[PDB]
Structures are given as structure tokens and as C-alpha cells.
A paper describes a structure:
TMEM87s are eukaryotic transmembrane proteins with two members (TMEM87A and TMEM87B) in humans. TMEM87s have proposed roles in protein transport to and from the Golgi, as mechanosensitive ion channels, and in developmental signaling. TMEM87A consists of a Golgi-dynamics (GOLD) domain atop a membrane-spanning seven-transmembrane helix domain with a large cavity open to solution and the membrane outer leaflet. We propose TMEM87A and structurally homologous GOST proteins could serve a common role in trafficking membrane-associated cargo.
Full-length human TMEM87A was expressed and purified from Sf9 insect cells and reconstituted into lipid nanodiscs composed of MSP1D1 and a mixture of DOPE, POPS, and POPC lipids. Cryo-EM was used to determine the structure of TMEM87A to a nominal resolution of 4.7 Å, with better resolved regions reaching ~4.3 Å in the core of the protein. About 37 N-terminal residues (amino acids 1–37), 88 C-terminal residues (475-555), and 36 residues in loops within the extracellular domain (145–173, 192–198) were not resolved in the cryo-EM map and are unmodeled. The second, between C89 and C431, tethers the bottom of the extracellular domain to the top of the 7TM domain in the H6–H7 linker, perhaps constraining their relative movement. In TMEM87A, helix 8 turns back towards the center of the protein and packs against the bottom of the transmembrane domain. The position of helix 8 in TMEM87A would sterically clash with putative G-protein or arrestin binding through interfaces analogous to those observed in GPCR structures. In TMEM87A, this cavity measures approximately 8,637 Å as compared to 12,350 Å for the WLS cavity. It is funnel-shaped, presenting a large opening to the extracellular side near the GOLD domain and tapering closed near the intracellular surface above helix 8. H5 and H6 are splayed apart to open a large ‘slot’ between the cavity and the upper leaflet of the bilayer. Density within the membrane exposed portion of the hydrophobic cavity is consistent with a bound phospholipid. A partial lipid is modeled based on density, chemical environment, and relationship to WLS, but we note this assignment is speculative given the relatively low resolution of the reconstruction.
Author numbering: 38 to 144, 174 to 191, 199 to 474
The structure:
């Protein structure tokens, strides 16, 4: 989120806040360039290692002075703080070579892997002073500008990009031998795989912008989450279509196919906008509002899938189609395992994310934005195992009916 804070020092506000999770031996450069003046400048900076997760991210910029008044007499805050209040007589003297050196720690090189907070207050003694010195706050760790909050997601997306690359190679290796036996579901699954390709490719490019150039582009994040929303929407659309048995039950569903794609479009029009809200860091009211129709939609759509699945299971039980019955029985078992794993992951992660008074284990929050993608990737792998090409796949996949 723009770790190189290019904030020009204004007259409207005098307090800058920077609260993240940082590597040990991370340095915080401050770059000061501006039109030199003659004003007395008192720069006070604070670097505090808040041991708890809550006192930095639930912390808001409104209570910066309240956090200061808590820290001065040690109310409600735990950890060690480091500070200096070096004074500058003239504005020009700030521009001159004043390479920062840390003074003394009271119980700017970082001392541990922890969530830190960084507060700068600039005492002035107006319109020109508004946005005069472009203060560039540059955080620089051992692995360049990347932070622990964003660190394991990057290597995780390395790994899962490798996973989909292997998936695409395997899919093409399967499709190379046989082409005349391919039906529309094969092209649709290939499309889902390629959507995963493009989505995780642009998202990885976004993290590459984060680590090398150190800048955040919101449009790439919009594109990535929009692609993911379209991808999972089309995936569950395929699940619903298969659960109704296209061709096996009815050659063309028609108006019910229109209602299926309308259900998919409604799911998009809610959940994709929800994901776009997650991109921009939606406020607490919008965040609380967003997931109610989302959760209701997941419950309703999944229940409809189970109803359709049991119904087509009964019909195929009447049909006495042996190998198809075995394959779709494995499909139902996969769906049961997927739903159970997903719901237990939801309960564990979401409940223990907020019920506990202090998230004291900061290291394992990269799983939260990763477990859904891991589950869905495993689901895609199982589906590709079930739908592997073969010589008798012409009779195995579909029968004239």
C-alpha cells in the first residue's frame, strides 16, 4: 500500500502515521526536499513495537494523540519505544545532510520481527508551508522493501503459480492425444484454468510492482479480484450445470439454463462488487454490510447444488449407467469433502480472527487470504483427475439420450 509514502508536509495536519509488520534490521529512510524557508522546525519521531496485533490496525489516525498520551505515561500499551526530538532552526538546515542515527531505546534500524508503529509530529514556529517538503518515507528491509504482512503471500503465489503452470502443462499433455472426443465441458475447464493463469499472473505482477518498484497500483488489484470473481462464478456455474445433467437429463435446459446464468449474474453483481470493496479497503460499515448477501448466496446456491445432485443421483441410479455412476459418486464425495473442509475453515479462521481479545500470533495471517484458493486449486486437481481423457471416453463421458 505505497510503502514509499511520498507525503508532502502540510499545514492542515502535523502527524504522520505508519503502522505495519516489519523485518528485523529494517531501516526507515526519510527524504526531505522542499523550497527552503526560515522557520523553526521541531521534528519528533516515535517507533514503538506494539506486541499485540490490535493496537496498530484497529488503531486509527484519529487517535494518534490519544496513543501518544497513552504511551507517555504507559496506559494500555505494551512493548518498547524509541524516540528522538531533534530540532531544526531553519527550513534549509533540514535539507542539508542529516543522515538519521538512532539514539537510544527506552523500555532507524529495527530490532525484531514484530508489528511496529511509526509516528512523526512536526512542530512549526502557511499556504507555502502546506505540502512544502515532500517527505518520502522509505521502508527498506533485508529482502528489499517488502514487509512481513505481504511477505509470505508473495512466496505462496510463487508456489501456486508453479502449481497452475504444472496444471496447464498436464492439461495440454492430456488434450494433445485426443481432440475429436472433446465436449464443451473440456473447453470450459480449460477456460477456468486459463482464467486462473491470467488472474494469478496479473496479481503476481502486482506484487512484483510492490517489491521492486515499491508502488501500489489499484487498477491491477481491481483486475485481479474481478478476474477471480468471474473465474469462481463460471466454475460454480459449471458445477450447477453438471448437477442438472446437461444432455444426460435434458439435451438443452433452455429457460432453466437462462435462470442458471441469471443466478450466476446475480452472484457476480453481488460478490464481485464485494471483492472490489475488499480491494479498496472498504470501511467498517461497508465491510459489515457486504458479506450478508454473500453468505446467503453461498448457502442458497450450495443447497440448490445438493438438491440437484441428489435428484440426478436418483435418476442415474434408475439409468443403470455403471462407470458414470462410479465417477459421479466420486464427484459427490469430492463435493462433500470440499464443503466440510470449507465450512470448518470458515468457522475456525473467521471466529478466532475476532473473538479473541488480542491476536498474539501475528505470523499466520497470510493463510487467511490463501486457504480458499488452496481448497479451490485442490478441487480443480480432483476434477481433472476425474475427467482425464481416455480411448473409451466417448462412451464414458456421454451417451445418446
Amino acid at each position: 500500500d505505497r510503502s514509499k509514502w511520498h507525503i508532502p508536509i502540510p499545514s492542515g495536519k502535523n502527524y504522520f502515521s505508519f503502522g505495519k509488520i516489519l523485518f528485523r534490521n529494517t531501516t526507515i529512510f526519510l527524504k526531505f526536499d522542499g523550497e527552503p524557508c526560515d522557520l523553526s522546525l521541531n521534528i519528533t519521531w516515535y517507533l514503538k513495537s506494539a506486541d499485540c496485533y490490535n493496537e496498530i490496525y484497529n488503531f486509527k489516525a484519529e487517535e494518534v494523540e490519544l496513543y501518544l498520551e497513552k504511551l507517555k505515561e504507559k496506559r494500555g500499551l505494551s512493548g518498547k519505544y524509541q524516540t528522538s526530538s531533534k530540532l531544526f532552526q531553519n527550513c534549509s538546515e533540514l535539507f542539508k545532510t542529516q543522515t538519521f542515527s538512532g539514539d537510544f531505546m527506552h523500555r532507524l534500524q529495527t530490532w525484531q520481527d514484530a508489528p511496529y508503529i511509526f509516528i512523526v509530529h512536526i512542530g512549526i514556529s502557511e499556504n507555502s508551508l502546506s505540502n512544502l517538503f515532500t517527505m518520502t518515507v522509505e521502508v527498506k528491509g533485508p529482502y528489499e522493501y517488502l514487509t512481513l504482512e505481504d511477505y509470505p503471500l508473495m512466496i505462496f503465489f510463487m508456489v501456486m503459480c508453479i502449481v497452475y503452470v504444472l496444471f496447464g502443462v498436464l492439461w495440454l499433455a492430456w488434450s494433445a492425444c485426443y481432440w475429436r472426443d472433446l465436449l464443451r465441458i473440456q473447453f470450459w475447464i480449460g477456460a477456468v484454468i486459463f482464467l486462473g493463469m491470467l488472474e494469478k499472473a496479473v496479481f503476481y505482477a502486482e506484487f512484483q510492482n510492490i517489491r521492486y518498484k515499491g508502488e501500489s497500483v489499484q487498477g491491477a488489484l481491481i483486475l485481479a479480484e474481478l478476474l477471480s470473481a468471474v473465474k469462481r462464478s463460471l466454475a460454480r456455474t459449471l458445477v450447477i450445470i453438471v448437477s442438472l445433467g446437461y444432455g444426460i437429463v435434458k439435451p438443452r435446459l433452455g429457460v432453466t439454463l437462462h435462470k442458471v446464468v441469471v443466478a450466476g449474474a446475480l452472484y457476480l453483481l453481488f460478490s464481485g462488487m464485494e471483492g472490489v470493496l475488499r480491494v479498496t479497503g472498504a470501511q467498517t460499515d461497508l465491510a459489515s454490510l457486504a458479506f450478508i448477501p454473500l453468505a446467503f448466496l453461498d448457502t442458497a446456491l450450495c443447497w440448490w447444488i445438493f438438491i440437484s445432485l441428489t435428484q440426478t443421483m436418483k435418476l442415474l441410479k434408475l439409468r443403470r449407467n455403471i462407470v458414470k455412476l462410479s465417477l459421479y459418486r466420486h464427484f459427490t464425495n469430492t463435493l462433500i469433502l470440499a464443503v466440510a473442509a470449507s465450512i470448518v475453515f470458515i468457522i475456525w479462521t473467521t471466529m478466532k480472527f475476532r473473538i479473541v481479545t488480542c491476536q498474539s500470533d501475528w505470523r499466520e495471517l497470510w493463510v487467511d487470504d490463501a486457504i480458499w484458493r488452496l481448497l479451490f486449486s485442490m478441487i480443480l486437481f480432483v476434477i481433472m483427475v476425474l475427467w482425464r481423457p481416455s480411448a473409451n471416453n466417448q462412451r464414458f463421458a456421454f451417451s445418446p439420450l
